[PDB]
Symmetry: C2
Subunit: 172 residues, 2 copies
């Protein structure tokens, strides 16, 4: 378990030499993978579109999941977004065990988006950035959640501090 702290040490050093969102994501995804999360997704939802919320999505998620996330208009009714946008704490979810939003969780479960850890963060301009860590094999028991809080918190701060600002305002 001491290996977990090395995982984050190597991530944050790589994030010091990542001046773009293209260079900043692989460190965060590699750390999440080392923590047991097969999938690592980041979404930037901007406040200025007002008429229609726009969701910018980067991640190693299945392409067909995002394709259906787009064609079915899931940004309008995304249950994870509604839960992380209202509260500051991380949201642990299970696609087989969530109430309502039947169509959303149906597609998520069909493509491995099954057992997730999601945390939302805000920037100076009011944009919402959501880091989502998903595994496709087993939901975490509470004892594994307890030990993963600090590492996931670390990754969550890293995504909001090193990835989100370089998605919102690229150097070029």
């Amino acid at each position: 378990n001491a290996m977990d702290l090395t995982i984050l040490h190597d991530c944050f050093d790589a994030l010091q030499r990542a001046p773009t969102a293209e260079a900043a994501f692989p460190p965060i995804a590699a750390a999440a993978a080392a923590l047991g999360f097969r999938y690592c997704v980041y979404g930037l939802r901007r406040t200025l579109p007002l008429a229609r919320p726009d969701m910018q999505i980067v991640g190693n998620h299945p392409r067909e999941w995002e394709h259906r996330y787009v064609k079915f208009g899931y940004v309008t009714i995304d249950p994870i977004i509604k839960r992380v946008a209202s509260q500051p704490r991380p949201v642990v979810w299970n696609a087989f065990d969530e109430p309502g939003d039947t169509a959303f969780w149906h597609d998520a479960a069909c493509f491995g988006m099954r057992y997730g850890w999601s945390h939302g963060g805000y920037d100076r301009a009011g944009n919402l950035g959501v880091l989502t860590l998903v595994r496709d094999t087993t939901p975490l028991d509470a004892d594994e959640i307890s030990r993963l809080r600090a590492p996931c918190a670390s990754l969550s701060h890293a995504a909001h501090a090193y990835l989100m600002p370089r998605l919102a305002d690229p150097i070029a």
Copy 2:
């Protein structure tokens, strides 16, 4: 080094059963102390007061430093707030090497708040919470900063997610 993960593990366990700010701050401050930071200060700056910004300050700082901070209106000129608000990355400062703001840095260095680590986060309402971890001993070199990033990131997340909400509304 094996401790840093257990230092934070114990902190995050305590914050699960911490429904008040009186109960959320000590575990964070305890972790900051175990990481080498004697002073742990959290400030919540409001956007609403407009003409000048209100700021709640909670921490184990020397209290007479807080009294100067209010006496000379430092909330309007605070160099650290200025830098953690315009940028989402942490800020590492040295009260003897920071340019300008001579009066501000003189007062901070007077009460041992000399070599600090500060990070600012926002909430849905647009408020600014700032976690500041300070030493009175030695400056922060490039080597210790590297290994302190991941643990201090967890502390930032912990402060913004568990302490900031309790100051803002409960």
